[PDB]
Amino acid sequence: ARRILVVEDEAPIREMVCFVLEQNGFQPVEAEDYDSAVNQLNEPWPDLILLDWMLPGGSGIQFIKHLKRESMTRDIPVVMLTARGEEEDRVRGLETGADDYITKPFSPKELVARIKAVMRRI
């Protein structure tokens, strides 16, 4: 119920995210790229995925769209991680299937708020 898959290749950033999550009672799981993220999709299944738009190895769009093909993954909420500004406004306009978005450098308060709100919904 608190298994959060964190898909971010930059170590310090990925660690900042995991620290905020762990300190807040969540159980973070790390992935550094498209394929390693895909390798985490099995029981126990992530309850939420934080997806870096710029993850190496593939398209964040296809990653999300491919989740909708199976029972155990189609209702997992995905929050797209985006760089503040241009990328953000831009990615928001794409057909990604993301349930919500969070901008980097991230705000610990926004990270927890959006995860709380997204899970309440989805």
All domains in the chain, ordered by first residue: 1-122 (3.40.50.2300)
Contact between residue 42 and residue 54 where contact means Cβ atoms under 8 Å apart: no
Q: Tell me which H or E stretch contains 81.
A: strand 78-83
Give the integer Cα–Cα distance in Å for 113 and 111. Answer: 6
Is residue 57 left, alpha or beta, with left meaning phi > 0 and alpha meaning psi from -120 to 50? left
Q: Which of 122, 113, 10, 12 is nearest to 55 (CA)?
A: 10
How many other CB atoms are found less than 10 A from the CB of residue 92? 12
Nearest Cα residue to 46 out of 21, 80, 70, 75: 75
What does this entry list as its resolution, in Å?
1.9
The coordinates were experimentally obtained by: X-ray
